[PDB]
């Protein structure tokens, strides 16, 4: 019996960080990062388990079926918060196009959204747990033809067909440039707002610009956080896979290697997925700043 590093999901010592994503104007979604990473970690465990031996290669689409049903179940719990979620969307809709009452509305609905996620903790936890029980069951039943010379074809295959592509996608993008261009945009909006919010007094616009800029700095912070992780994990992953790929290991060492790799991947995938999603929301809110700033013509 192994030492899994994604094990507890009901250890209140570490806060369940919730990410808000507003990719397109008028749409909203959320991710409970602990749950996302957990679920993904056991997705890599399951695949590395069926790919280690050639006899189980074909069973891939049955694992895909399971994972999909598990995901389908998790989405059903997220949709139980749709009321508060939609209540927040229309609030932002009114706020982007009273401001005290408007902001009180935003704060109340946003807090009710998080409170909702707390209400369904047990439901999410069960769905994640069934996935752990599955991945662990498969991984526990992982065997080699010779326990002293275990094959590494499963690790190699899984990495090439599931993880490698994302490493190249990340390397092709200059994420640090994306953050420098985003800081440039935020500094620009602050300059144009402070210079605009000096005298000419029209209530409505000033408040909307200040609000969108606030949101954009929060989204930026999340992008910087994930990009940082993505860089760390890209070097780590690329440098580790090299040593677990073309050789054989003892059963115990092989499982230590697979666990470690699965945990790395999980953190990488999580923050990558979130990075792209928040990138889309940052430029979605930027388009609204361009519109409101352009709409500032006195004719």
């Amino acid at each position: 019996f192994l030492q899994y590093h994604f094990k507890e999901l009901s250890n209140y010592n570490i806060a369940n960080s919730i990410d808000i994503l507003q990719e397109k104007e008028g749409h909203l979604d959320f991710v409970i990062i602990p749950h996302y990473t957990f679920l993904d970690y056991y997705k890599h465990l399951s695949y590395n388990s069926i790919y280690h031996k050639s006899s189980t290669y074909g069973k891939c689409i049955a694992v895909d079926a399971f994972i999909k049903k598990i995901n389908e179940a998790y989405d059903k719990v997220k949709s139980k918060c749709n009321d508060i979620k939609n209540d927040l969307i229309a609030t932002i809709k009114k706020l982007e196009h009273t401001f005290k009452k408007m902001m009180d509305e935003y704060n109340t609905k946003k807090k009710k959204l998080i409170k909702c996620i707390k209400n369904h903790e047990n439901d999410f936890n069960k769905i994640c747990m069934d996935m752990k029980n599955y991945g662990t069951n498969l991984f526990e039943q992982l065997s080699c033809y010779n326990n002293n010379f275990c094959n590494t074809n499963g690790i190699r295959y899984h990495y090439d067909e599931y993880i490698h592509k994302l490493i190249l996608s990340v390397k092709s993008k200059n994420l640090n440039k994306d953050l420098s261009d985003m800081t440039n945009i935020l500094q620009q909006s602050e300059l144009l707002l402070t210079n605009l919010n000096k005298k000419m007094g029209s209530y409505i616009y000033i408040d909307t610009i200040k609000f969108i800029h606030k949101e954009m700095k929060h989204i930026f912070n999340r992008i910087e956080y994930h990009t940082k992780i993505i860089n760390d994990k890209t070097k780590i992953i690329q440098d580790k896979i090299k040593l677990n790929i073309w050789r054989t290991f003892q059963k115990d060492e092989l499982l230590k290697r697979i666990l470690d790799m699965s945990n790395e991947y999980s953190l990488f995938i999580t923050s990558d997925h979130l990075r792209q999603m928040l990138y889309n929301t940052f430029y979605s809110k930027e388009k609204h700043l361009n519109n409101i700033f352009h709409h500032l013509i006195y004719v």
């Epitope: 069926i50 069973k59 689409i61 049955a62 694992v63 895909d64 079926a65 399971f66 999909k68 049903k69 389908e72 069951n137 498969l138």
Partner: antibody
Framework: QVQLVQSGAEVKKPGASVRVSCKAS????????ISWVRQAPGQGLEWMGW????????NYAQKLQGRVTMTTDTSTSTAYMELRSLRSDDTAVYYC??????????????????????WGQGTTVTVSS | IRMTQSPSTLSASVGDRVTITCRAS??????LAWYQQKPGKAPNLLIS???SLESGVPSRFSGSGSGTEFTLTISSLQPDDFATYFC?????????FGQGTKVEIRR
């Protein structure tokens, strides 16, 4: 929001054949299968067969072997079921259910233990002269 | 392959604890699905494998059993629960169903 929508009810004379469609929706039909279970009037549920959306493989019940055919059209993600040479004891309600993609696979199926979760409203088939 | 339930026509009230047994001819390991069907409606999956009742099922249903016999428990009957219940075998692809247990309100 995942659903299976079956074809309209049928009235068929004994000996004729019937095709019952089960059009799936809002899931990845290609990585899932479809079973078929029928319920005579007043009696229980009797399994018919299973057909995958990956392999296009099939497992037909021994009592119906040769008389039943069932294919899959992943372009429209629809599963069909054709029962030929109908007889009076075939009068029943026909149901289709979302199943595992490898049911009667070579070895184990400990990769998807969930039974038949999503189902269809059903299709009443009347075999009477 | 031969599924045989215990009670054919059970009679319980709202709040009662209801237990339905499902015995088999041969050995099944953990593969026994439970289903609920109201007359004139398509069945609904309740539990699969041992006690893994798929999401959206009342957190009062339960399944205990291995080998030839199993049980479906409803800790506290609600008005919606009055329907007929079935068990299914899936150790081998040739699925088989139980005779069904109709749950009636006892007045």
């Amino acid at each position: 929001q995942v659903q299976l929508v079956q074809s309209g009810a049928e009235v068929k004379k004994p000996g004729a054949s019937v095709r019952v469609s089960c059009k799936a929706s809002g899931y990845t039909f290609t990585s899932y299968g479809i079973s078929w279970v029928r319920q005579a009037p007043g009696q229980g549920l009797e399994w018919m067969g299973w057909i995958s959306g990956y392999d296009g493989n099939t497992n037909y019940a021994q009592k119906l072997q040769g008389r039943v055919t069932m294919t899959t059209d992943t372009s429209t993600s629809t599963a069909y079921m054709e029962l030929r040479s109908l007889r009076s004891d075939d009068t029943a309600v026909y149901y289709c259910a979302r199943d595992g993609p490898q049911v009667g696979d070579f070895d184990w199926q400990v990769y998807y233990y969930y039974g038949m979760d999503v189902w269809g409203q059903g299709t009443t088939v009347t075999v009477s002269s | 392959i031969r599924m045989t339930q215990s009670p054919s026509t059970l009679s319980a009230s709202v709040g009662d604890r209801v237990t339905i047994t499902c015995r088999a001819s041969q050995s099944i390991n953990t593969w026994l699905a439970w289903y609920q069907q109201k007359p004139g409606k398509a069945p609904n999956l309740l539990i699969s494998k041992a006690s893994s009742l798929e999401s959206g099922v009342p957190s009062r249903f339960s399944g205990s059993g291995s080998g030839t016999e199993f049980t479906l428990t409803i800790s506290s009957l609600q008005p919606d629960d009055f329907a007929t219940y079935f068990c299914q075998q899936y150790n081998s692809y040739l699925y088989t169903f139980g005779q069904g247990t109709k749950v009636e309100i006892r007045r």
